[PDB]
Protein backbone atom coordinates (compact mmCIF):
# COMPACT_ATOMS: atom_id res chain seq x y z
CA UNK A 1 0.00 0.00 0.00
CA UNK A 2 1.30 3.71 -0.49
CA UNK A 3 2.20 5.21 2.09
CA UNK A 4 0.91 8.58 1.30
CA UNK A 5 -2.85 7.58 1.01
CA UNK A 6 -4.76 8.17 4.20
CA UNK A 7 -6.55 4.89 5.89
CA UNK A 8 -9.52 7.17 7.27
CA UNK A 9 -10.78 10.25 8.31
CA UNK A 10 -12.49 11.70 12.17
CA UNK A 11 -14.88 13.58 13.56
CA UNK A 12 -14.11 15.14 16.79
CA UNK A 13 -15.75 17.40 19.10
CA UNK A 14 -13.77 18.61 22.27
CA UNK A 15 -12.59 21.34 24.77
CA UNK A 16 -10.37 23.28 21.80
CA UNK A 17 -13.19 23.02 19.65
CA UNK A 18 -14.78 20.64 16.96
CA UNK A 19 -13.92 19.21 13.45
CA UNK A 20 -12.25 16.22 12.51
CA UNK A 21 -8.51 15.01 10.71
CA UNK A 22 -7.17 12.77 8.24
CA UNK A 23 -5.27 9.59 9.28
CA UNK A 24 -2.58 7.58 8.10
CA UNK A 25 -1.02 4.55 9.17
CA UNK A 26 2.50 3.53 8.36
CA UNK A 27 2.26 0.33 10.27
CA UNK A 28 0.38 -1.46 12.96
CA UNK A 29 2.13 0.91 15.50
CA UNK A 30 2.91 4.31 13.84
CA UNK A 31 0.06 6.89 12.44
CA UNK A 32 -0.55 10.27 11.45
CA UNK A 33 -3.15 12.40 12.10
CA UNK A 34 -3.40 15.90 10.43
CA UNK A 35 -6.80 17.96 12.11
CA UNK A 36 -8.63 21.22 12.39
CA UNK A 37 -10.54 22.57 15.18
CA UNK A 38 -12.37 25.48 15.16
CA UNK A 39 -16.01 26.54 15.81
CA UNK A 40 -17.07 29.05 18.32
CA UNK A 41 -19.92 28.20 21.18
CA UNK A 42 -21.32 30.63 23.69
CA UNK A 43 -22.86 28.64 26.70
CA UNK A 44 -24.72 31.33 28.54
CA UNK A 45 -26.67 29.62 31.04
CA UNK A 46 -29.37 30.46 34.15
CA UNK A 47 -28.69 27.54 36.40
CA UNK A 48 -28.13 29.68 39.24
CA UNK A 49 -25.06 27.96 41.74
CA UNK A 50 -24.75 29.13 45.20
CA UNK A 51 -26.17 32.84 43.65
CA UNK A 52 -23.70 33.04 40.97
CA UNK A 53 -24.63 32.62 36.90
CA UNK A 54 -21.66 31.98 34.48
CA UNK A 55 -21.49 33.18 30.88
CA UNK A 56 -18.97 31.45 28.42
CA UNK A 57 -17.68 32.27 25.36
CA UNK A 58 -15.04 30.31 23.63
CA UNK A 59 -13.56 30.93 20.26
CA UNK A 60 -11.10 28.45 18.32
CA UNK A 61 -8.79 28.17 15.60
CA UNK A 62 -6.08 25.24 15.65
CA UNK A 63 -4.08 23.32 13.34
CA UNK A 64 -2.35 19.94 14.56
CA UNK A 65 -0.08 17.13 13.50
CA UNK A 66 -0.07 14.26 15.70
CA UNK A 67 1.78 10.91 16.06
CA UNK A 68 -0.14 8.43 17.07
CA UNK A 69 1.75 5.10 18.84
CA UNK A 70 0.33 2.08 19.92
CA UNK A 71 2.02 -0.24 21.65
CA UNK A 72 0.00 -3.06 21.22
CA UNK A 73 -0.77 -1.69 17.21
CA UNK A 74 -0.95 -5.35 15.64
CA UNK A 75 -3.18 -6.81 18.70
CA UNK A 76 -6.86 -7.99 17.02
CA UNK A 77 -7.96 -6.88 20.76
CA UNK A 78 -10.14 -4.10 19.98
CA UNK A 79 -9.11 -2.50 23.57
CA UNK A 80 -5.61 -3.28 23.41
CA UNK A 81 -5.10 -1.77 19.78
CA UNK A 82 -7.20 1.69 20.60
CA UNK A 83 -4.83 2.26 22.79
CA UNK A 84 -2.28 5.06 21.86
CA UNK A 85 0.02 7.88 22.87
CA UNK A 86 -0.10 11.03 20.78
CA UNK A 87 2.86 13.37 20.04
CA UNK A 88 2.78 16.18 18.16
CA UNK A 89 2.33 19.76 17.30
CA UNK A 90 -0.10 22.57 16.61
CA UNK A 91 -1.08 26.05 15.60
CA UNK A 92 -3.28 27.47 18.66
CA UNK A 93 -5.38 30.03 18.44
CA UNK A 94 -8.13 29.72 21.28
CA UNK A 95 -10.72 32.46 23.25
CA UNK A 96 -12.08 32.49 26.36
CA UNK A 97 -14.19 34.85 27.66
CA UNK A 98 -15.68 34.29 30.75
CA UNK A 99 -18.28 35.74 33.04
CA UNK A 100 -19.47 35.66 36.44
CA UNK A 101 -22.54 37.01 37.70
CA UNK A 102 -22.70 37.21 41.56
CA UNK A 103 -26.38 38.10 42.75
CA UNK A 104 -26.78 40.55 45.49
CA UNK A 105 -25.92 39.88 49.04
CA UNK A 106 -24.15 36.59 48.02
CA UNK A 107 -20.76 35.40 48.66
CA UNK A 108 -18.21 34.10 46.55
CA UNK A 109 -14.28 34.01 46.38
CA UNK A 110 -11.46 35.51 44.33
CA UNK A 111 -7.83 34.81 44.98
CA UNK A 112 -8.53 32.29 47.98
CA UNK A 113 -10.58 35.49 49.86
CA UNK A 114 -14.14 35.47 50.29
CA UNK A 115 -16.70 38.67 49.57
CA UNK A 116 -20.24 39.49 49.64
CA UNK A 117 -21.69 41.33 46.98
CA UNK A 118 -23.36 44.18 47.66
CA UNK A 119 -26.79 45.54 46.41
CA UNK A 120 -26.04 45.95 42.99
CA UNK A 121 -24.70 42.76 42.54
CA UNK A 122 -21.39 42.06 41.20
CA UNK A 123 -19.64 41.42 37.48
CA UNK A 124 -16.65 39.29 36.75
CA UNK A 125 -15.66 38.94 33.32
CA UNK A 126 -12.32 37.63 32.17
CA UNK A 127 -10.96 37.52 28.51
CA UNK A 128 -7.77 34.61 27.95
CA UNK A 129 -6.23 34.02 24.61
CA UNK A 130 -4.03 31.30 23.59
CA UNK A 131 -2.22 31.98 20.65
CA UNK A 132 0.94 30.02 19.45
CA UNK A 133 2.50 29.87 16.09
CA UNK A 134 3.24 26.17 17.22
CA UNK A 135 3.22 24.47 20.41
CA UNK A 136 4.46 20.70 20.95
CA UNK A 137 1.56 18.32 22.45
CA UNK A 138 1.66 15.14 24.29
CA UNK A 139 -1.72 13.15 24.92
CA UNK A 140 -2.68 10.00 24.93
CA UNK A 141 -5.72 8.32 23.71
CA UNK A 142 -8.42 5.29 23.37
CA UNK A 143 -10.03 4.78 20.11
CA UNK A 144 -11.83 1.00 20.15
CA UNK A 145 -12.73 -0.08 16.85
CA UNK A 146 -16.82 -1.38 16.88
CA UNK A 147 -15.38 -2.98 13.35
CA UNK A 148 -12.76 -2.64 10.43
CA UNK A 149 -14.75 0.52 9.00
CA UNK A 150 -15.64 2.48 12.08
CA UNK A 151 -15.16 3.04 15.61
CA UNK A 152 -15.02 5.92 18.53
CA UNK A 153 -12.69 7.64 20.63
CA UNK A 154 -11.64 10.29 23.45
CA UNK A 155 -8.45 11.48 23.41
CA UNK A 156 -6.92 13.41 26.61
CA UNK A 157 -3.67 15.94 26.58
CA UNK A 158 -2.26 19.32 26.64
CA UNK A 159 0.04 21.66 24.90
CA UNK A 160 2.68 23.45 25.94
CA UNK A 161 1.48 27.48 25.23
CA UNK A 162 3.27 29.21 27.80
CA UNK A 163 0.79 31.50 30.19
CA UNK A 164 -1.96 33.16 27.97
CA UNK A 165 -2.88 36.51 27.57
CA UNK A 166 -5.33 37.42 30.12
CA UNK A 167 -7.48 40.55 31.15
CA UNK A 168 -9.56 39.82 34.40
CA UNK A 169 -12.22 42.94 35.56
CA UNK A 170 -14.44 43.33 37.97
CA UNK A 171 -17.65 45.87 38.26
CA UNK A 172 -19.88 46.50 41.28
CA UNK A 173 -19.20 45.93 45.17
CA UNK A 174 -18.57 43.76 47.54
CA UNK A 175 -17.27 43.71 51.61
CA UNK A 176 -14.91 41.66 52.80
CA UNK A 177 -12.54 41.19 55.70
CA UNK A 178 -9.73 39.40 54.17
CA UNK A 179 -6.29 41.45 53.37
CA UNK A 180 -7.04 42.49 49.76
CA UNK A 181 -9.60 44.84 48.12
CA UNK A 182 -11.74 43.01 45.39
CA UNK A 183 -9.88 44.97 42.87
CA UNK A 184 -6.63 43.68 44.06
CA UNK A 185 -7.67 39.86 44.32
CA UNK A 186 -9.29 40.18 40.93
CA UNK A 187 -5.89 41.29 39.58
CA UNK A 188 -3.96 38.62 41.70
CA UNK A 189 -6.09 36.21 40.13
CA UNK A 190 -4.78 38.04 36.65
CA UNK A 191 -1.52 37.83 37.79
CA UNK A 192 -1.58 33.79 38.56
CA UNK A 193 -2.66 33.36 35.50
CA UNK A 194 -0.16 34.93 33.40
CA UNK A 195 2.61 33.41 35.77
CA UNK A 196 1.96 30.47 37.49
CA UNK A 197 3.39 27.02 36.24
CA UNK A 198 0.31 25.57 36.12
CA UNK A 199 -1.20 28.21 33.83
CA UNK A 200 1.41 27.21 30.95
CA UNK A 201 -0.17 24.20 29.53
CA UNK A 202 -3.64 24.26 27.72
CA UNK A 203 -5.49 20.74 28.60
CA UNK A 204 -7.21 18.96 26.34
CA UNK A 205 -10.22 16.74 26.00
CA UNK A 206 -11.84 15.44 23.37
CA UNK A 207 -14.45 12.73 21.83
CA UNK A 208 -15.39 11.30 18.65
CA UNK A 209 -16.01 9.05 15.39
CA UNK A 210 -13.25 6.99 13.27
CA UNK A 211 -14.22 6.13 9.64
CA UNK A 212 -12.23 3.79 7.58
CA UNK A 213 -12.45 3.42 4.22
CA UNK B 1 -44.80 -21.64 72.37
CA UNK B 2 -45.66 -18.99 75.04
CA UNK B 3 -46.25 -15.77 73.40
CA UNK B 4 -44.85 -13.85 76.86
CA UNK B 5 -41.37 -14.98 76.04
CA UNK B 6 -39.21 -12.95 73.57
CA UNK B 7 -37.49 -15.15 70.97
CA UNK B 8 -33.94 -12.62 71.10
CA UNK B 9 -32.59 -9.92 71.37
CA UNK B 10 -30.76 -7.10 69.36
CA UNK B 11 -28.08 -4.97 69.38
CA UNK B 12 -27.89 -1.71 67.77
CA UNK B 13 -26.28 2.21 66.83
CA UNK B 14 -28.03 4.82 65.73
CA UNK B 15 -29.13 8.35 65.23
CA UNK B 16 -30.95 8.09 68.94
CA UNK B 17 -28.05 6.51 70.65
CA UNK B 18 -26.50 3.08 70.82
CA UNK B 19 -28.12 0.14 72.50
CA UNK B 20 -30.24 -2.83 72.07
CA UNK B 21 -33.66 -3.83 72.38
CA UNK B 22 -36.04 -7.44 73.43
CA UNK B 23 -37.73 -9.10 70.85
CA UNK B 24 -41.38 -10.78 70.91
CA UNK B 25 -42.94 -12.88 67.69
CA UNK B 26 -46.82 -13.51 67.98
CA UNK B 27 -47.17 -14.88 64.68
CA UNK B 28 -44.88 -14.65 61.60
CA UNK B 29 -46.75 -11.54 60.80
CA UNK B 30 -46.46 -9.67 64.39
CA UNK B 31 -44.04 -8.98 66.65
CA UNK B 32 -42.70 -6.65 69.23
CA UNK B 33 -39.72 -4.69 70.45
CA UNK B 34 -39.28 -3.18 73.56
CA UNK B 35 -35.71 -1.27 73.78
CA UNK B 36 -33.12 1.17 74.99
CA UNK B 37 -31.11 3.79 73.27
CA UNK B 38 -28.75 5.75 75.31
CA UNK B 39 -25.42 6.70 75.76
CA UNK B 40 -23.59 9.74 74.64
CA UNK B 41 -20.89 10.83 72.18
CA UNK B 42 -18.86 13.94 71.43
CA UNK B 43 -17.87 14.42 68.06
CA UNK B 44 -15.03 17.11 67.86
CA UNK B 45 -13.67 17.05 64.20
CA UNK B 46 -10.73 19.44 63.25
CA UNK B 47 -11.25 18.60 59.54
CA UNK B 48 -12.16 22.00 58.14
CA UNK B 49 -14.91 21.96 55.82
CA UNK B 50 -14.96 25.67 54.17
CA UNK B 51 -13.27 27.40 56.74
CA UNK B 52 -15.41 25.92 59.41
CA UNK B 53 -15.10 22.99 61.81
CA UNK B 54 -18.20 22.04 63.71
CA UNK B 55 -17.91 20.15 66.59
CA UNK B 56 -21.49 17.45 68.01
CA UNK B 57 -22.25 16.92 71.64
CA UNK B 58 -25.35 14.42 71.82
CA UNK B 59 -26.67 12.90 75.04
CA UNK B 60 -29.57 10.49 74.69
CA UNK B 61 -32.11 8.33 76.98
CA UNK B 62 -34.98 7.07 74.94
CA UNK B 63 -37.16 4.27 76.28
CA UNK B 64 -39.04 2.29 73.19
CA UNK B 65 -41.68 0.02 72.68
CA UNK B 66 -42.59 -0.83 68.27
CA UNK B 67 -45.48 -3.43 67.05
CA UNK B 68 -43.27 -5.03 63.64
CA UNK B 69 -45.60 -5.99 61.09
CA UNK B 70 -43.98 -8.17 58.18
CA UNK B 71 -45.73 -8.71 55.28
CA UNK B 72 -44.51 -11.35 53.97
CA UNK B 73 -43.39 -12.76 57.54
CA UNK B 74 -44.10 -16.22 56.95
CA UNK B 75 -41.48 -16.09 53.51
CA UNK B 76 -38.37 -18.01 53.61
CA UNK B 77 -36.93 -15.66 51.22
CA UNK B 78 -34.89 -13.85 53.84
CA UNK B 79 -35.12 -10.51 51.91
CA UNK B 80 -38.45 -10.99 52.13
CA UNK B 81 -39.28 -12.05 55.64
CA UNK B 82 -36.81 -9.27 56.61
CA UNK B 83 -38.55 -6.28 55.61
CA UNK B 84 -41.28 -4.51 58.15
CA UNK B 85 -43.12 -1.71 59.16
CA UNK B 86 -42.52 0.01 63.05
CA UNK B 87 -45.23 1.53 64.62
CA UNK B 88 -45.25 2.47 68.11
CA UNK B 89 -44.12 4.88 70.90
CA UNK B 90 -41.02 6.02 73.14
CA UNK B 91 -40.25 7.94 76.23
CA UNK B 92 -37.49 10.49 74.55
CA UNK B 93 -35.02 12.56 75.95
CA UNK B 94 -32.21 13.84 73.95
CA UNK B 95 -29.88 16.65 73.80
CA UNK B 96 -27.66 17.91 71.02
CA UNK B 97 -25.10 20.67 70.97
CA UNK B 98 -23.71 21.70 67.63
CA UNK B 99 -20.97 23.98 67.55
CA UNK B 100 -19.62 25.74 64.11
CA UNK B 101 -16.09 27.53 64.45
CA UNK B 102 -15.82 29.94 61.47
CA UNK B 103 -12.42 30.97 60.63
CA UNK B 104 -11.46 34.40 60.07
CA UNK B 105 -12.49 36.17 57.36
CA UNK B 106 -14.60 33.22 55.81
CA UNK B 107 -17.62 33.23 54.45
CA UNK B 108 -20.72 30.94 56.44
CA UNK B 109 -24.50 31.14 56.00
CA UNK B 110 -27.38 31.70 58.32
CA UNK B 111 -30.94 31.83 57.66
CA UNK B 112 -30.33 31.78 54.18
CA UNK B 113 -27.81 34.63 54.25
CA UNK B 114 -23.99 34.57 53.54
CA UNK B 115 -21.90 36.29 56.52
CA UNK B 116 -18.43 36.93 55.92
CA UNK B 117 -16.07 36.44 60.15
CA UNK B 118 -14.12 38.98 60.75
CA UNK B 119 -10.17 39.22 61.84
CA UNK B 120 -11.41 37.16 65.15
CA UNK B 121 -13.54 34.80 63.96
CA UNK B 122 -16.92 33.64 64.91
CA UNK B 123 -18.38 31.33 66.60
CA UNK B 124 -22.05 29.30 66.94
CA UNK B 125 -23.63 27.29 69.26
CA UNK B 126 -27.00 25.83 69.37
CA UNK B 127 -28.67 23.89 71.95
CA UNK B 128 -31.60 21.80 71.37
CA UNK B 129 -33.06 19.20 73.15
CA UNK B 130 -36.37 16.38 72.40
CA UNK B 131 -38.08 15.71 75.51
CA UNK B 132 -41.27 13.73 75.57
CA UNK B 133 -43.26 11.80 78.58
CA UNK B 134 -44.47 9.32 75.15
CA UNK B 135 -43.96 10.44 71.49
CA UNK B 136 -45.95 8.22 68.60
CA UNK B 137 -43.51 6.61 66.04
CA UNK B 138 -43.47 5.21 62.73
CA UNK B 139 -40.68 3.53 60.58
CA UNK B 140 -39.62 0.93 58.34
CA UNK B 141 -36.70 -1.88 58.85
CA UNK B 142 -35.17 -4.27 56.81
CA UNK B 143 -33.63 -7.29 58.48
CA UNK B 144 -32.47 -9.96 56.76
CA UNK B 145 -31.47 -13.07 58.38
CA UNK B 146 -27.78 -14.86 57.89
CA UNK B 147 -29.43 -17.76 59.60
CA UNK B 148 -32.08 -19.18 61.81
CA UNK B 149 -29.79 -17.77 64.67
CA UNK B 150 -28.95 -14.30 63.98
CA UNK B 151 -29.43 -11.20 61.60
CA UNK B 152 -28.47 -7.80 60.78
CA UNK B 153 -30.36 -4.98 60.04
CA UNK B 154 -31.45 -1.01 59.49
CA UNK B 155 -34.53 1.03 60.52
CA UNK B 156 -35.41 4.24 59.40
CA UNK B 157 -38.45 6.50 61.01
CA UNK B 158 -39.18 9.33 62.73
CA UNK B 159 -41.29 10.28 65.99
CA UNK B 160 -43.51 13.23 66.10
CA UNK B 161 -42.16 15.10 68.84
CA UNK B 162 -43.23 18.81 68.32
CA UNK B 163 -40.85 21.30 67.97
CA UNK B 164 -37.45 20.90 70.29
CA UNK B 165 -36.53 23.55 72.57
CA UNK B 166 -33.77 25.06 70.82
CA UNK B 167 -30.88 27.98 72.32
CA UNK B 168 -28.82 29.32 69.02
CA UNK B 169 -26.32 31.80 70.16
CA UNK B 170 -23.65 33.67 68.10
CA UNK B 171 -19.73 34.94 69.24
CA UNK B 172 -18.12 37.51 67.24
CA UNK B 173 -18.60 40.12 64.42
CA UNK B 174 -19.59 39.54 61.10
CA UNK B 175 -20.05 41.53 58.08
CA UNK B 176 -22.71 41.49 55.60
CA UNK B 177 -25.04 43.33 52.92
CA UNK B 178 -28.08 41.34 53.38
CA UNK B 179 -31.08 42.38 55.30
CA UNK B 180 -30.11 40.68 58.72
CA UNK B 181 -27.37 41.87 60.96
CA UNK B 182 -25.72 38.20 62.42
CA UNK B 183 -27.29 38.18 66.12
CA UNK B 184 -30.95 38.36 63.80
CA UNK B 185 -29.86 35.47 60.99
CA UNK B 186 -29.32 33.62 64.60
CA UNK B 187 -32.29 34.26 65.64
CA UNK B 188 -34.48 33.45 63.12
CA UNK B 189 -33.24 30.20 62.87
CA UNK B 190 -33.98 29.46 66.39
CA UNK B 191 -37.49 30.43 65.94
CA UNK B 192 -37.69 28.46 62.75
CA UNK B 193 -36.83 25.04 64.82
CA UNK B 194 -38.66 26.10 67.62
CA UNK B 195 -41.83 26.45 65.19
CA UNK B 196 -41.39 24.83 61.71
CA UNK B 197 -43.35 21.66 60.57
CA UNK B 198 -40.55 20.37 59.32
CA UNK B 199 -38.96 20.70 63.23
CA UNK B 200 -41.95 18.71 64.59
CA UNK B 201 -40.56 15.21 63.67
CA UNK B 202 -37.07 13.44 65.04
CA UNK B 203 -35.83 11.35 62.19
CA UNK B 204 -34.03 8.07 62.97
CA UNK B 205 -31.64 6.01 61.52
CA UNK B 206 -30.31 2.66 62.82
CA UNK B 207 -28.12 -0.71 62.26
CA UNK B 208 -27.87 -3.63 64.54
CA UNK B 209 -27.60 -7.13 64.86
CA UNK B 210 -30.53 -9.55 65.06
CA UNK B 211 -29.65 -12.73 67.82
CA UNK B 212 -32.30 -15.25 68.12
CA UNK B 213 -32.24 -18.42 70.23
C1 LIG C 1 -17.94 7.90 22.48
C2 LIG C 1 -17.57 9.08 21.59
C3 LIG C 1 -18.51 9.18 20.39
C4 LIG C 1 -18.79 10.63 20.04
O1 LIG C 1 -18.31 14.14 16.67
C5 LIG C 1 -19.22 14.86 15.87
C6 LIG C 1 -18.81 16.33 15.81
O2 LIG C 1 -18.18 16.66 14.58
C7 LIG C 1 -18.38 18.01 14.22
C8 LIG C 1 -18.26 18.17 12.71
C9 LIG C 1 -16.30 21.09 11.61
C10 LIG C 1 -14.97 21.73 11.20
O3 LIG C 1 -15.20 23.06 10.80
C11 LIG C 1 -15.69 23.86 11.85
C12 LIG C 1 -15.67 25.33 11.42
O4 LIG C 1 -16.94 25.88 11.66
C1 LIG D 1 1.94 1.35 30.78
C2 LIG D 1 2.06 0.07 31.60
O1 LIG D 1 2.83 -0.94 30.95
C3 LIG D 1 2.08 -2.12 30.73
C4 LIG D 1 2.89 -3.39 30.99
O2 LIG D 1 1.98 -4.32 31.57
C5 LIG D 1 2.58 -5.40 32.27
C6 LIG D 1 1.50 -6.42 32.65
O3 LIG D 1 1.22 -6.39 34.04
C7 LIG D 1 0.90 -5.12 34.54
C8 LIG D 1 1.95 -4.58 35.51
O4 LIG D 1 1.43 -4.44 36.81
C9 LIG D 1 1.93 -5.39 37.73
C10 LIG D 1 2.27 -4.63 39.01
O5 LIG D 1 2.33 -5.53 40.10
C1 LIG E 1 3.98 2.11 27.13
C2 LIG E 1 4.27 0.70 27.64
C3 LIG E 1 4.26 -0.33 26.52
C4 LIG E 1 3.83 -1.70 27.03
O1 LIG E 1 4.59 -2.70 26.38
C5 LIG E 1 3.87 -3.89 26.14
C6 LIG E 1 3.31 -4.49 27.43
O2 LIG E 1 2.46 -5.54 27.03
C7 LIG E 1 1.46 -5.88 27.95
C8 LIG E 1 0.52 -6.83 27.22
O3 LIG E 1 -0.82 -6.38 27.24
C9 LIG E 1 -1.67 -7.27 26.55
C10 LIG E 1 -1.93 -6.77 25.13
O4 LIG E 1 -2.25 -7.82 24.23
C11 LIG E 1 -1.20 -8.10 23.32
C12 LIG E 1 -1.00 -6.91 22.40
O5 LIG E 1 -0.35 -7.27 21.21
C1 LIG F 1 6.11 18.66 25.22
O1 LIG F 1 7.00 19.41 26.05
C2 LIG F 1 7.91 20.19 25.30
C3 LIG F 1 8.83 20.96 26.24
O2 LIG F 1 10.04 21.25 25.57
C4 LIG F 1 9.94 22.42 24.77
O3 LIG F 1 9.15 24.58 22.56
C5 LIG F 1 8.25 25.49 21.95
C6 LIG F 1 7.12 25.73 22.94
O4 LIG F 1 6.45 26.93 22.64
C7 LIG F 1 5.72 27.40 23.76
C8 LIG F 1 6.67 28.14 24.71
O5 LIG F 1 6.14 29.41 25.05
C1 LIG G 1 -13.78 12.31 27.59
C2 LIG G 1 -12.35 12.84 27.48
C3 LIG G 1 -12.17 14.05 28.39
C4 LIG G 1 -9.86 17.73 29.69
C5 LIG G 1 -9.12 18.91 30.30
C6 LIG G 1 -10.07 20.03 30.73
C7 LIG G 1 -10.30 21.07 29.64
O1 LIG G 1 -10.16 22.39 30.14
C8 LIG G 1 -9.97 23.34 29.11
C9 LIG G 1 -10.16 24.77 29.61
O2 LIG G 1 -8.90 25.33 29.90
C10 LIG G 1 -8.84 26.74 29.76
C11 LIG G 1 -7.41 27.16 30.06
O3 LIG G 1 -6.83 26.11 30.81
C12 LIG G 1 -6.23 26.51 32.02
C13 LIG G 1 -5.26 25.42 32.48
O4 LIG G 1 -5.66 24.96 33.75
C1 LIG H 1 -25.25 -4.05 58.73
C2 LIG H 1 -25.50 -3.63 60.17
C3 LIG H 1 -24.61 -4.40 61.14
C4 LIG H 1 -24.17 -3.51 62.29
O1 LIG H 1 -24.35 -2.77 67.12
C5 LIG H 1 -23.39 -2.82 68.15
C6 LIG H 1 -23.61 -1.65 69.12
O2 LIG H 1 -24.25 -2.07 70.31
C7 LIG H 1 -23.89 -1.27 71.42
C8 LIG H 1 -24.06 -2.05 72.71
C9 LIG H 1 -25.69 -0.19 75.45
C10 LIG H 1 -26.94 0.22 76.22
O3 LIG H 1 -26.57 0.99 77.35
C11 LIG H 1 -25.94 2.20 76.99
C12 LIG H 1 -25.79 3.07 78.23
O4 LIG H 1 -24.45 3.50 78.32
C1 LIG I 1 -45.41 -1.60 49.02
C2 LIG I 1 -45.66 -2.07 47.59
O1 LIG I 1 -46.58 -3.16 47.52
C3 LIG I 1 -45.99 -4.31 46.94
C4 LIG I 1 -46.94 -5.04 45.99
O2 LIG I 1 -46.13 -5.53 44.93
C5 LIG I 1 -46.83 -5.87 43.74
C6 LIG I 1 -45.87 -6.57 42.77
O3 LIG I 1 -45.53 -5.73 41.68
C7 LIG I 1 -45.03 -4.47 42.05
C8 LIG I 1 -45.97 -3.33 41.66
O4 LIG I 1 -45.37 -2.48 40.70
C9 LIG I 1 -45.95 -2.60 39.41
C10 LIG I 1 -46.13 -1.18 38.88
O5 LIG I 1 -46.26 -1.21 37.47
C1 LIG J 1 -47.49 -2.98 52.46
C2 LIG J 1 -47.94 -3.73 51.20
C3 LIG J 1 -48.10 -5.22 51.46
C4 LIG J 1 -47.83 -6.03 50.20
O1 LIG J 1 -48.73 -7.11 50.13
C5 LIG J 1 -48.18 -8.28 49.56
C6 LIG J 1 -47.65 -8.03 48.15
O2 LIG J 1 -46.96 -9.20 47.79
C7 LIG J 1 -45.96 -9.03 46.81
C8 LIG J 1 -45.18 -10.34 46.77
O3 LIG J 1 -43.80 -10.14 46.97
C9 LIG J 1 -43.10 -11.36 46.93
C10 LIG J 1 -42.84 -11.87 48.35
O4 LIG J 1 -42.69 -13.29 48.40
C11 LIG J 1 -43.81 -13.93 48.99
C12 LIG J 1 -43.90 -13.54 50.46
O5 LIG J 1 -44.63 -14.47 51.20
C1 LIG K 1 -47.62 9.05 64.19
O1 LIG K 1 -48.37 10.25 64.03
C2 LIG K 1 -49.21 10.52 65.14
C3 LIG K 1 -49.98 11.81 64.90
O2 LIG K 1 -51.18 11.78 65.67
C4 LIG K 1 -50.96 12.18 67.01
O3 LIG K 1 -50.01 12.42 70.04
C5 LIG K 1 -49.02 12.64 71.04
C6 LIG K 1 -47.83 13.29 70.35
O4 LIG K 1 -47.03 13.97 71.30
C7 LIG K 1 -46.20 14.93 70.67
C8 LIG K 1 -47.00 16.21 70.42
O5 LIG K 1 -46.31 17.34 70.91
C1 LIG L 1 -28.60 3.05 57.57
C2 LIG L 1 -29.95 3.57 58.04
C3 LIG L 1 -29.94 5.10 58.07
C4 LIG L 1 -31.71 9.05 59.40
C5 LIG L 1 -32.27 10.45 59.67
C6 LIG L 1 -31.17 11.46 59.98
C7 LIG L 1 -30.86 11.58 61.47
O1 LIG L 1 -30.81 12.93 61.88
C8 LIG L 1 -30.92 13.06 63.29
C9 LIG L 1 -30.54 14.46 63.76
O2 LIG L 1 -31.70 15.24 63.93
C10 LIG L 1 -31.59 16.26 64.90
C11 LIG L 1 -32.95 16.95 64.98
O3 LIG L 1 -33.62 16.66 63.77
C12 LIG L 1 -34.11 17.79 63.09
C13 LIG L 1 -35.19 17.35 62.10
O4 LIG L 1 -34.80 17.71 60.80
Known sequence: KNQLIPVGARAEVGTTGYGGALLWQANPYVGLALGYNGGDISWS???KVNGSTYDLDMDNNNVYLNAEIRPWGASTNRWAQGLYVAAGAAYLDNDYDLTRNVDATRSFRVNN???????????????????????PYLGFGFAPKINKNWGVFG??????????????????????????????????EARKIANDDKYKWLPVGKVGVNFFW
Do not use: H, R
Open 45 to 47: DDV
Open 155 to 188: EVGAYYTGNPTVKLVSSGSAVTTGDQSLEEAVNA
Open 113 to 135: QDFIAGADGVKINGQMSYKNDIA
